[PDB]
Structure 1
């Protein structure tokens, strides 16, 4: 409801974001070609997802700040900081699709697979990261929460890269790694690689912007939001294999990439010795026939039905956490996000 409402306004602000980041060409014509590249990078990689994180900043901001304090400039800062989390996301996906050997993203060919781009996308991605701090300087430099936002974006990146490092270590190319695919390890990976930047970061940004800076308040929000993030990544794993890619906008690679997916961890908890063998001989390889063998094994094990049960039990648990930890923040802040992702198909 409230996200659907805000979507079109959020997305409409993207022009200004592009215009402000491309305006520092005025005084330095010599960087013109780079700034034109930057604009193409922004248009290609910052558009076409759900904008759940940027919108969470805006929705939460509106719900946490007294409407009488939501003047024209305040609101612009809020959808600029929302856009900052979108740019963080864009940076991460561009680099991640290279590392995962992905083909499509958000319904088009991954940036690095475009003829003429290739591994230059590595620089493109980092530029997107640099844009976050340019926007924070340009719009929030005078605000009491400026340092807070800077340290929060920098810390969230570090935590996410640490998680990406656990993701890549647990998934070596060319090697079996079945022994490492545990529930415990899974939880640690998704906590760091997904939950901090995709759930905590946007709500925490809006908190700091509303002057809510206490450690206890931030730790409470984190208890809900890290659990929401773990759940969200489990849905992403489920969708990598069982989603419709004209809906999800992306082709899956977890089985080929030898990834510690929620699906493989479940598969393992339930496999007989002979099925364990099927998994061992077929998992983490590029052969289409071997990926199909693994899928058939998952479906044999009713894994889609096991995912639907986990999703219900988990949502219930997240709602309990909301009842426990939302105060003094409005529960709507957390529920609006839960309902945006509960039972999602993309």
Structure 2
């Protein structure tokens, strides 16, 4: 219920002051490295607390739906919350580094960190530091737990997978020639998977699983079978709802074609296009100019993307049902249903 959902969110949110105290409390005042950590508190507070928390909040909902009454105590719930904030700091480090190699300007409604005065290129070393924080929170809360080295391995691994997709991106979509010869089905897909699906959907629940003992390669692979899918439908949606939706929205609210973004639509346009339009596309798609931009959107609409999306998301929420009823044998199906509910509802 909203009563419950809302309640859970506020519980997580109000924990961040605690986390900050965990990462810095003692660094501060240390007669050698005190100022360094003194500044860390600021990096922490400036970049970490921000989104809906939907990622870290998934851990909490998952362990809740998975633990038996013998493991729903204060000391165990707080580790649920703390490992939830670890996903959030997992995102904050990638984001900070992301912006810099993008020369971005705004994030979470504020000015990117590196763009801040005094900062700039130091932001790289603070990207390293937030990441160093994912593991110090794990160690504070779970070092004396049978599941520890599992979480440790999960994080250092998903961090490797997102880093891989992050580089598939930095390659595929380069300003230079911009190139539309690369924006293809399997490469777009391959980017959504590593760069996003992994740490966004599998990682959260996967950490809930390891916490209630479930470490079987089979059940974990049954988790990848469907989270890696909602991770797809989520990105497609958060790409379609970009130009083609406005009436109530949030996130990277605005639009971005100024950046040569290998999005769904693009791959879909090139997919079903004529030589003239193809040339038009590789001529108007890729720059901040009211002119060329809207001509790209005219073409997408001229081609038939409003249809392409529907028949897809119309089949997506179906495949998912068949991927659940076929993969949620041990794991409580309610976990995915509840997750899907926050996702499967597009805007035209």
TM-score normalised by the chain length of structure 1: 0.93
8 Å contact from structure 1 (residues 256, 286) kept in 2: yes
Equivalent residue number for residue 274 of structure 2:
272
Distance 1:187 1:6, change over 3 A: same
Q: Is the 8 A contact 2:28 2:37 kept in 1?
A: no
1:138 to 132, 140, 143: 140
Verify the 8 A CA contact 1:163 1:189 in the aligned structure 2.
yes
CA distance in 1: counterparts of 2:78 and 2:313, whole angstroms: 36
User: Following TM superposition, by how much is the alpha carbon of 1:250 offset from its aligned partner in structure 2, in angstroms?
Assistant: 3.0
- Relative CO higher for 1 or 2, CA cutoff 8 Å, sep ≥ 6? 1
Q: Is the 8 A contact 1:200 1:222 kept in 2?
A: yes
Structure 1 CA distance for aligned equivalents of residues 272 and 122 of structure 2: 43
SS in 2 for 1:179: coil
**Alpha-carbon distance between aligned partners in 2 of 1:79 and 1:271, rounded to the nearest angstrom:** 48
Call closer, same or farther: CA 1:196–1:9 in 2, change over 3 Å: same
Give every structure 1 segment of 4 or more consecutive aligned residues whose post-TM-superposition deviation is greater than 6 Å. none
> Which is helix-richer, 1 or 2?
1
Which residue in 1 is equivalent to 2:163? 161
State the partner residue of 1:217.
Answer: 219
Q: 2:61 aligns with which of 49, 59, 62?
A: 59
Residues matched between the structures, number: 345
Between the aligned partners of 2:320 and 2:44, the Cα distance in structure 1 is: 34
C-alpha change, 1:24 and 1:240, in structure 2 (3 Å) is farther
Give the match for residue 260 of structure 1. 262
Match of 1:289 among 288, 291, 310: 291
**1:157 & 1:128 partners in 2: Cα distance?**
13
In structure 1, C-alpha distance between the alignment counterparts of 2:110 and 2:245, rounded to whole Å: 16
- Give the structure 2 partner of residue 23 of structure 1: 25
- Counterparts of 1:55-134 in structure 2, within 5 Å, are 55-134=57-136
Quote the offset at 1:108 in angstroms: 2.2
Report the CA distance between 1:329 and its aligned residue: 1.0
Alignment of 1:180-329 (within 5 A): 180-242=182-244, 244=246, 247-250=249-252, 254-329=256-331
Give 1:251 deviation, angstroms.
5.8
Deviates more, 1:116-125 or 1:163-172: 116-125
Q: 1:309 and 1:103, CA in 2 relative to 1: closer, same or farther beyond 3 A? A: farther
2:16 match: 14
Residue 115 of structure 1, CA deviation: 3.1
Residue 14 of structure 1, CA deviation = 0.9
Structure-2 separation of matches of 1:269 and 1:4: 42
Offset, 1:56: 0.5
